[PDB]
Amino acid sequence: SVIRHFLRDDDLSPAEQAEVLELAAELKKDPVSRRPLQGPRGVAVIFDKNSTRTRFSFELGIAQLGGHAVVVDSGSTQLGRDETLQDTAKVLSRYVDAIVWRTFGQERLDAMASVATVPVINALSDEFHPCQVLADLQTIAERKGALRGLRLSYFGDGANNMAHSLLLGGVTAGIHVTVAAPEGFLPDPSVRAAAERRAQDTGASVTVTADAHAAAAGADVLVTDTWTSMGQENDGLDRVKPFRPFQLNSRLLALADSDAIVLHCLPAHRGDEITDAVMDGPASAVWDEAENRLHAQKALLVWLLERS
Amino acid sequence: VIRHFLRDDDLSPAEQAEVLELAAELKKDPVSRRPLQGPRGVAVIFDKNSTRTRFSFELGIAQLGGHAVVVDSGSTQLGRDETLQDTAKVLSRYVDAIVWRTFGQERLDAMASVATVPVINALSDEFHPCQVLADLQTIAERKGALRGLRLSYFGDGANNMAHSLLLGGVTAGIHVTVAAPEGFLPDPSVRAAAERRAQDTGASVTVTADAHAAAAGADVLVTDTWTVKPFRPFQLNSRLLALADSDAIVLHCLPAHRGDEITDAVMDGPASAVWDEAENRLHAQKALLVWLLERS
Amino acid sequence: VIRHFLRDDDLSPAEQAEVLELAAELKKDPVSRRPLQGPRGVAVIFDKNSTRTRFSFELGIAQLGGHAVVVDSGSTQLGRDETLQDTAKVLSRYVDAIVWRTFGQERLDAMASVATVPVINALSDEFHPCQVLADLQTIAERKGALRGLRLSYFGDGANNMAHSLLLGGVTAGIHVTVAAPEGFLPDPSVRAAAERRAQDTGASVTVTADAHAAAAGADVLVTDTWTSMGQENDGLDRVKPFRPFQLNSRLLALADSDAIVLHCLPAHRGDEITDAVMDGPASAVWDEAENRLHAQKALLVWLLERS
Ligand SMILES: FC(F)(F)c1cc(Br)c2nc[nH]c2c1
Structure with missing residues (x-):
C-alpha cells in the first residue's frame, strides 16, 4: 500500500x-x-x-x-x-x-x-x-455550510506559510482565494501556479492584489496573520510600514459581506495585523478555529x- | 460558576x-x-x-x-x-x-x-x-479529627508554607502557631485573612519568636527550607520535639536540607510523617x- | 526481595x-x-x-x-x-x-x-x-540458540557497551572477544566478573589488539562510537588508535559468512563503521534498535x- x-x-x-x-x-x-x-x-x-x-x-x-x-x-x-x-x-x-x-x-x-x-x-x-488550514476550513464550514464558491481574502505577508496554505487548501475546497499583500511580499511563484492549476479543477480562482479595500469587498471570510515570523526579525526590512494599509480593522471588515467571519492563526499582535475590535468582536471565529x-x-x- | x-x-x-x-x-x-x-x-x-x-x-x-x-x-x-x-x-x-x-x-x-x-x-x-491539603490529609489519617489540634510551623514565617498553613490550618479548625525570627513574619493581609477565618471554625492564630513555647504541647510540628543565622534557633531538632504532646507528628514539604532546618534524628524518627505526607x-x-x- | x-x-x-x-x-x-x-x-x-x-x-x-x-x-x-x-x-x-x-x-x-x-x-x-538485552534478542532471532556463538566487539574496550557485551554475553554462553588498542582495555573488575560468570556457562573472555584475529570466524561483530561527550575533552587523540579497529568490509569478510553486525546507535558513518557494512546484508542494526x-x-x- 502506498x-x-x-x-x-x-x-x-x-x-x-x-x-x-x-x-x-x-x-x-x-x-x-x-x-x-x-x-x-x-x-x-x-x-x-x-x-x-x-x-x-x-x-x-x-x-x-x-x-x-x-x-x-x-x-x-x-x-x-x-x-x-x-x-x-x-x-x-x-x-x-x-x-x-x-x-x-x-x-x-x-x-x-x-x-x-x-x-x-x-x-x-x-x-x-x-x-491550520484544515482547521480553518472546518471552522468556515461550521458557520457557513458548503465551502464551494465562498470568497476568502487573506491580508498581510503574502509569502508566509498561511498565505501559501490558504491558497492551496482554499482552492482545493472550491473557495475563491484572494491574497492582498504589498509589492515585494507576494506568494512564491511555484505555489501560486500550483494553486491556479488546482483551482481549475474545482472552479475556484486565485487573485493577488495590492488593493486591500478591493480584496475585502464582498468577501465571506477575512484572514490575517502576524506580519513577521521569528526567522524574519533580523532580515533587515521595515516590516511594519509596508503592511499598515493591510490591517484587518473595523473599516476593512465593514466592506465585506454582512455575515463575514474573521480568522487568524495564533498568536496575534493586536494593533498590527488586526485590531482588538475585530479580534474580539462578533465576526471573529479565532477561538473555534484554534479548537478545531x-x-x-x-x-x-x-x-x-x-x-x- | x-x-x-x-x-x-x-x-x-x-x-x-x-x-x-x-x-x-x-x-x-x-x-x-x-x-x-x-x-x-x-x-x-x-x-x-x-x-x-x-x-x-x-x-x-x-x-x-x-x-x-x-x-x-x-x-x-x-x-x-x-x-x-x-x-x-x-x-x-x-x-x-x-x-x-x-x-x-x-x-x-x-x-x-x-x-x-x-x-x-x-x-x-x-x-x-x-501541599497543605496533603498535610491535612496526613494529620487526619494519623490523628483523626483536625479541629482543636495545635500545629506549629517553624522557620521562615514569610514563605508560601507559612501562609498556607495559616489559612488552610484555620480552615480545618487547627490552632496555628508560626515561630519565626523578626524579619520573616507572615504577610499582614494573609495573617488577617487567617484570623478572620479562624473565628468561624473555633481556631486561632499565633505568631511568636519563641520556639520553645511554640513546640510546647504541639500536636503537629512543621518546617521547610530556610532559603542564615536568624533561623538556627528554630531548627526542628531532637530537643524541641521532646516538648510536644506525645504522639506528635512532624511534617516537612520536601526537599529537606538535613542538619539545617531539621535533624536526621527527627526526620528519620517515629514522629516523622514526611514520606506519607509526600505520597498524599x-x-x-x-x-x-x-x-x-x-x-x- | x-x-x-x-x-x-x-x-x-x-x-x-x-x-x-x-x-x-x-x-x-x-x-x-x-x-x-x-x-x-x-x-x-x-x-x-x-x-x-x-x-x-x-x-x-x-x-x-x-x-x-x-x-x-x-x-x-x-x-x-x-x-x-x-x-x-x-x-x-x-x-x-x-x-x-x-x-x-x-x-x-x-x-x-x-x-x-x-x-x-x-x-x-x-x-x-x-541495550545488550536487545542485542541478545536480535542475535537469537537471527541465529537461534546463543550458547557457543562467537561475538567480537571492536573499538573503545572500556566503555559501557564493551563492559555489557562481556557480562551479558558470557551470561548467555557467548564467547566474547574485545578488540581494543592498548590503554583502552576493559575495566579489570568487569573482566574478572565476566571471566567468573563464563565458567558457569561454558563461555570465554578474550581481549586482544589484533582486529583481524578478533574478526576471524566471528558470528557477530559489534562496534560503537569511539568517544562519548564526556570524553571529548580528555586530551587524547581518540581517532588514530581506533582506525585499525574500524568495522569495514574487509574486516567483515574475515568473519563467518553468516555473520551479523550490531551497533547500538547513533553511528558515525566513516569512523567506527562504514556505510557498506551498516547498510549491507549482514547489518541487524534496525531490528536491534526496535528490540x-x-x-x-x-x-x-x-x-x-x-x-
Ligand atoms: F528514533 C529515535 F531513535 F528514537 C530518535 C528520535 C529522534 Br526525534 C532523534 N533525534 C536525534 N536522534 C534521534 C533518535
Missing part, C-alpha cells in the same frame, strides 16, 4: 480533502469514537520550535485516538546532527505509526517523508501550515493511517 | 472537609473516579520546574482517566506576540482544567478571571495550598481536581 | 533466558501483558538525555498499561537538592519502578539500596545492560513480578 504523507495542502485531492473535513466534523461530535492507535500505538511529535496550539492539539488528539504521543524538542535532541536524517527515520519507523514534525525548511520534511515508512505530517513549516486544530488533525491522522 | 483553587481559603470549611474526605476515599481506591475518561486533557504548566509537583499531578490526572499535557520552564518565555488572556482562551478549548506553578499571585488571578475551566495553583511565591500530594490533588471538575 | 537491573550479571543465566523468552513473546503480542494497568507510574529520569532511550521506555511502559513520568536533564539534577536516599523514598511512593540514566555506578547502587521498587539502569558510564522496546518491556514485566 504510504500517504501530508506536507502541503495539495497533498490531498479535492475529494480527499472533503473526506478529511467530513471526518473532522464527525470527530468533533464523537471525539473518542475512532481508535486506530489503540494499544497504545506511538506517534512521534517533533518540534524544532515550540507552539502551544501544536503541542496541545496533537498530544491530546493522538491520545483520543487511543495512541501515545512521544513529544520531542529537537533542539534538545539535536536532530539531524547526532546522526543522519535517514538513520533517525529508520528507527522512528520501528517505534511509531506516524511522524508529526514542526520544522523550518520544506526540503527537510520531503527528505523525512521519502525515507520513513510511516505517514509524515507537517505540523508547521516555513512554507506551509496545512493543519484538535478535531481536524485527528481526522487527518485517522485518514492517513487508514490509507497507509 | 467556575471554581478555582489559588489559595487555601478559596475552600470554605465545609468544602475543604469534602475535598479531604475525597482524598481519603481516593487513597483507598485510586482508579475509582474517572471524570477525565477519554482521555480529557489537563494542562500542567511550570514557569519554574518542580519534579515532585510534576510526578504527583501527572500521575494523578492519568489515574482520573485523563492526559496531562506537561509544559516545562524552557517554554516559559512565550514567543513573539503571545499573551496570557489569549493563552487562557485557547487552553480552555483543549483541556478541562489548568494546573500552574508560577510566581506572583497576580498572574494566577489573571488566568483565573479569563479561563473557563478551573485553575489550580500548583505552587506560587505566596501560597502552596496543594498525589491523593489530595486528585481529590481537589475531582471536586473542582464536578462544580465546573 | 526487590530485584534491580543495574548491570547485566544482575540476572543469572537462567533469569536472563527467562527475560529474553519474554521479549520474544512480547514482540509477538505487545499489549497482552498489563502489570502496570491503572495506570501505575514508572519514573524515567535522565541526568543526560537519550532520545532513543526515551522513545523505547516511554512507549514500552504505556504498552504495559502504565504511565511513564519522563524527567529530562533540564531539571535540577538528582542529588544536588536532597540526598539520593530521600529522593528514592519519595519516588517509591509515586511509581512502581525507577528507570534512570546517570553517570557513575555508585549513584545507581545508592538509589537501589533504599528504593522499595525495582531500579533499572537505562544507560550509565560503566554499563548499558538494556530495545521489546526487551525493556520484558525486563520490566519480569522485575515487577519478582518484586
